[PDB]
Design a protein around this ligand. Structure first.
Ligand SMILES: Cc1cc2nc3c(=O)[nH]c(=O)nc-3n(C[C@H](O)[C@H](O)[C@H](O)COP(=O)(O)OP(=O)(O)OC[C@H]3O[C@@H](n4cnc5c(N)ncnc54)[C@H](O)[C@@H]3O)c2cc1C
Length: 427
């Protein structure tokens, strides 16, 4: 039934060997949990393995691969509801949903993530400030718990506490077998985008707190983290909203829902070029153009700093560029309101993802960053993390004790466990 397998997160680091059950048979899954529950080092569900960290592996224990469980059960355009197996991925879901005029309500940077993964990490996207994160759009889920019973959870009424502990719970309340998502109605597969380019960090912040952000449903930015000030924190901002059919050019209006370095570069002329090409209004783009503006030895690092703490945010960015650690691929966004999940990552404030080449001193440098992020009231994302301490984590997520208490009810015997749970002491 199982197979000894060497697993790593997307970051290809911190490997552990587990026994991996891969089956499309939901009853065999129920029975494997029932088995582990009788006996140990517990079990954890795994999706497409896109989380960079250690949350979907379980050294010396059981790992259940959920991807073969990928049935879309129904889609209903009138209710906007979608009933799907947890192994369904968001790209699969997106293609199936389109002909109904339905848009996946939250999309992350890659569509190769399972619904179970999207819920357990409570994922966010370019529309977080207008739409929240993934958990906000789940109307029901079926959770396989430690007792081998399947519980039907909904965001309100009874069992809401377990529901909201599961969202962002990193698989640690049990296995999401199935869920109902409420989709976003759309009449097209396209975006209308405005683009803006700023010349400094001070400007980037300025553009994000002037009010204009309320005019867009989607917003994010490419961020210079390498240049010394003033150029530090300059950005290319891409903001927009889903087009309606009347906004499409003629050629595209018959099929509105279908998805299908020189010598000048670092000089004044390319400064003008980049500025010009990054500044546009009412441009219609497909998903790949708008949302997908696109390995081994890198360290992903993502944090959010509370909105008010803006001077502290500027401080952290300053620390980053003068560190001698250079990140070229940086994504910035202002998050909106948070949800009620205790371990949910997003909070209203300044969010950034960076990507550091693995190098001498980087490990000790990120620990120091951790300290700064913590002190500044912010947190890091478990999906992007493999090396922070339990002490740092628990301070970053003050409702962790609230969460752990919920987990102890539903898993007294510690049937569900992962590398991350042990490292972060969520066990
Ligand atoms: C290139 C890239 C870009 C990304 N961009 C973003 C982004 O913009 N925003 C964002 O929020 N994230 C982003 N991520 C992270 C990704 O969205 C999350 O890590 C997501 O959880 C990955 O889903 P997965 O199916 O691969 O799950 P895995 O990585 O396999 O698992 C992640 C967690 O979900 C749990 N889980 C999986 N299935 C189940 C289940 N059926 N029941 C219970 N628990 C389950 C696992 O136990 C594990 O704890 C990105 C990742 C990559 C590689």
């Amino acid at each position: 039934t199982t197979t000894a397998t060497r697993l790593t997160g997307w970051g290809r680091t911190a490997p552990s060997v587990a026994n991996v059950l891969r089956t499309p048979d939901a009853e065999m899954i129920v029975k494997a949990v029932a088995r582990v529950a009788e006996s140990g080092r517990g079990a954890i569900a795994r999706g497409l393995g896109r989380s960079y960290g250690d949350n979907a592996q379980n050294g010396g224990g059981l790992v259940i691969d959920m991807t073969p469980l990928n049935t879309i059960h129904s889609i209903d355009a009138d209710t906007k509801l979608v009933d799907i197996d947890a192994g369904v991925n968001l790209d699969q879901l997106m293609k199936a949903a389109l002909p109904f005029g339905l848009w996946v309500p939250v999309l992350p940077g890659t569509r190769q993530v399972t619904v179970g993964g999207a819920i357990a990490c409570d994922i966010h996207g370019k529309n977080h400030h207008s739409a929240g994160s993934f958990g906000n759009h789940v109307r029901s889920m079926d959770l396989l718990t430690a007792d081998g019973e399947i519980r039907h959870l909904t965001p309100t009424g009874e069992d809401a506490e377990l529901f909201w502990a599961t969202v962002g719970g990193n698989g640690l309340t049990g296995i999401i077998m199935r869920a109902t998502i409420e989709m976003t109605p759309t009449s097209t597969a396209y975006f209308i985008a405005d683009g803006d380019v700023t010349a400094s960090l001070d400007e980037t912040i300025a553009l994000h707190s002037d009010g204009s952000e309320a005019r867009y449903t989607y917003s994010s930015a490419w961020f210079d983290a390498i240049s010394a000030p003033p150029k530090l924190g300059r950005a290319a901002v891409s903001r927009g909203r889903l087009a309606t059919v009347e906004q499409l050019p003629a050629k595209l209006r018959s099929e509105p829902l279908k998805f299908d370095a020189n010598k000048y570069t670092f000089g004044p002329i390319g400064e003008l070029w980049y500025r010009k090409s990054g500044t546009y209004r009412g441009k219609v783009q497909n998903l790949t153009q708008f949302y997908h503006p696109l390995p081994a030895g890198f360290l992903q690092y993502q944090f959010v700093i509370p909105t008010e703490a803006v001077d502290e945010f500027k401080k952290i960015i300053g620390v980053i560029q003068a560190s001698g650690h250079y990140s070229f691929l940086n994504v910035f966004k202002l998050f909106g309101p948070r949800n009620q999940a205790p371990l949910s990552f997003p909070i209203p404030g300044w969010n950034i993802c960076v990507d550091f080449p693995i190098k001498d001193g980087l490990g000790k440098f990120v620990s120091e960053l951790d300290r700064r992020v913590l002190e500044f009231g912010g947190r890091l994302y478990t999906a992007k993390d493999s090396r922070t301490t339990a002490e740092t984590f628990h301070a970053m997520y003050p409702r962790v004790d609230e969460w752990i208490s919920v987990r102890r009810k539903v898993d007294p015997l510690r049937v569900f466990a992962s590398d991350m749970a042990r490292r972060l002491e969520l066990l």
